């Protein structure tokens, strides 16, 4: 809720703030309203290299335990 206030959202982190005092199922469709409305922002279309850079660049090490990979 403090990452959502750096971005500028000041009235969506007030509904989650005022729901956490009760933690009730009778006000939970307000919390799924905010989760459903967030997908209508739009798609994140990028370049193919720029969106497959964090996926294809990983750190493989040999400091795993090999006793766990024999059972796997």
């Amino acid at each position: 809720l403090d990452n959502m206030r750096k971005a500028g959202l000041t009235d969506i982190p007030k509904m989650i703030q005022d729901w956490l005092v009760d933690c009730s199922i009778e006000k939970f469709p307000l919390m799924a309203k905010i989760y459903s409305w967030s997908f209508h922002v739009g798609f994140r279309k990028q370049k193919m290299l720029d969106a497959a850079l964090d996926q294809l660049k990983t750190e493989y090490t040999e400091d795993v335990d090999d006793e766990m990979y024999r059972e796997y």
């Binding site: 660049k57 990983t58 493989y60 090490t61 040999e62 990979y69 024999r70």
Partner: protein, 49 residues
């Protein structure tokens, strides 16, 4: 990039239909464990004959 290897402990299993009989052992030279050798000889005083 690097990829760490992983060799699993495996063997080669065969069916009973193909287990070949072993080769017949025959030998081509005698079993030698000793050989002669030419050494010099010394007499009773200590000199060389």
């Amino acid at each position: 990039k690097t990829i760490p290897t992983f060799e699993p402990k495996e063997s080669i299993l065969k069916k009973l239909e193909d287990i070949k009989p072993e080769q017949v052992k025959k030998q081509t030279k005698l079993f030698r464990i000793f050989e002669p050798r030419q050494l010099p000889v010394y007499r009773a005083n200590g000199e060389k004959e």
